[model samples]
Target: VYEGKAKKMIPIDDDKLIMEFKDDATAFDGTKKARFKGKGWLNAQLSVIFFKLLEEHGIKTHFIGVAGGNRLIVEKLDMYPLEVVVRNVVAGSLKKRLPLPEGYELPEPIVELYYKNDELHDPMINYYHAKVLGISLDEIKKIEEIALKVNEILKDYLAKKGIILVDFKLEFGKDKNGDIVLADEISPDTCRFWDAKTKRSLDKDVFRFDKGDLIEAYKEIYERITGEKPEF
Candidate 1:
């Protein structure tokens, strides 16, 4: 069992875990935090939508089923200590490092690997760093392949829903069968979602930068994707 910034994993069995989506919102590696009513439920439902979307498109994920309002039953795996990121647009940390302006769509998506260590602020790393961390070259290649494919799938899917998939972080793990599968939740907490028309932040940036009501932004994503109002 484990508790993370936005979710908790309670072991159901040797191969199953219950992921409890927590309402706590965090940024800058936990320097900022807040709890919004229904935030957990919103993220949990949103993650289900994305995980199901990926699964339908032949992507392997840890998602099993929704347990209730804010919990999910998922497969437990030996998680890799890497954050595989895919960026479709020039935004977030990229603006700080690149000369390109934010919102500029890259000619192609960018895939990045980061060390998933809080003490080091999750520094962007290369294959060498990954190899030093015990990941083989072939495994790193496979990780990038899956990350890029996920970007393609989500970018197209979200574009139709009137949102831009700016960028997102992903975690992968080895299942009981020893095959790498996508792990961790895919929600606003891990993605930068922007409104296509208004260009407004509809993800955690709203909370991170005080742009607008956090819950309202999350609700918009829910309604836009599910085509229904959030009952909670």
Candidate 2:
């Protein structure tokens, strides 16, 4: 019923679902895109690993586990349709918004919300706009709180792996029980993962800036995060 730049969801029985990661590489708002080899398998692997780590740290998510290569079994959510972005180090949009150059570390994490309306092109919005769209203040508050918690957990772990969580995006949703939890994929496609020592791009930015191969970049992330070589 739905197709996105990265993956597609297949609805299953009783509120559970599956995600099929794709080989499609895209940037510049889908203007630049392609289907690549092995991209989907690596993304699915990274997502499963990251979800398991988050669960171990007590962060609630829709992730269940891997189903097959390039696929995942996940809990379905009544999604919020918002992207909660948390920045631990100034990069990407923050640098573009401000005068600061890249690699500017913040004393704290900055939380931002973007309305996830593709027709509106997922424009950035404030709490007022969120309210206008029927997102309750209580929900917004919970979204911000959980987003920060996720940043804290991911930041520490990525740092230990010799990777900097330059910044990343997040999505939230209400579960069947009406409790807010993390939704959507957490992968290089949605984040800026830089090498700790080299400060090089190990993410979709490889595609974004024409820096290098996406697989090589993602490979760096996988090796660092898991400390093991990826077969794909």
Candidate 3:
């Protein structure tokens, strides 16, 4: 078993993997951390929503289905060491890097790739760096395509729910079929979601900034998605 800040990976034989979501939350490269009970359960539920939605729209992913609370079964994939990010709204580090007023929507969404080295702070890279890492141009292109498609899908759905898909991070892996498919979880922890009406952060930024009730914010996100109360 391999443990991560927010998940645990157990090799369930040769072609199967089990991902156990953790209640632990961290920000700014794990500089801050906390354990919010049931956090993992909510995230697992939310991840199912996003993954299934993407799969329905023809986006391949490693997700199989819910195994139990805070746990899921997935196809074993040869994970990539690259991280893909898509930004639709000006916020976070983008705000510090770019001069944009009023948090207005970006005229064009930006897709970025980073070498997934936490020690190096997952420093941003370009196609050249990806090539250096042995990710061929074709693979890089596919990564970009999937990332953009994911943004399009989530943006529209969240918009209807009055939440803006501000930005999000993605990771992909190669399946047994030698196809690169989306892997990892997608939830508030890995996404920047904001209440469209009030533009209030509905994601991890709350925990990162000590803004307000963290669990309440997550509960609201789940409520917004499922239209019901999450177990508190």
- Cα miss at 72, model 1 (Å)? 0.6
Candidate 2 C-alpha error for residue 163, in Å: 0.5
TM-scores, all candidates, are: 0.97, 0.96, 0.97
Tens-digit lDDT string for candidate 3 (1-232) = 9999999999888987888889999987788999988889888999998999999999999998778788889888988898799999888888667888647789989998889997798988998988999999999999999899999999999999999999999999998788999999998899999998999988888999988977889999999999999963
Mind giving the per-residue lDDT tens digits that candidate 1 earns over 32-70?
Answer: 989999999999999999999999999999999999999
Q: Which 10 residues in a row give candidate 1 its minimum summed lDDT?
A: 22-31
The lDDT leader among the candidates is 1
In candidate 2, clashing pairs total: 0
The reply for model 1, stretches above 4 Å from the true place, is none
Q: Write the per-residue lDDT of candidate 2 for residues 1-232, one digit (tens) a residue.
A: 4677889898888788888999998888789987779889888998888889889988899998788798899999988879899988888779878787789988888888998877989899999999999898988998898888888888888888888998889888889789998888889988888889989989998898889888888887888888799886
The alpha-carbon root-mean-square deviation between model 2 and the true structure, to one decimal in Å, is 1.2
The runs of at least 3 residues in candidate 3 whose Cα sits more than 4 Å from the true structure, single-residue gaps closed, are none
Clash pairs detected, candidate 3? none
As for candidate 2, its clashing pairs are none
lDDT of 3: 0.90
TM-score between model 2 and native:
0.96
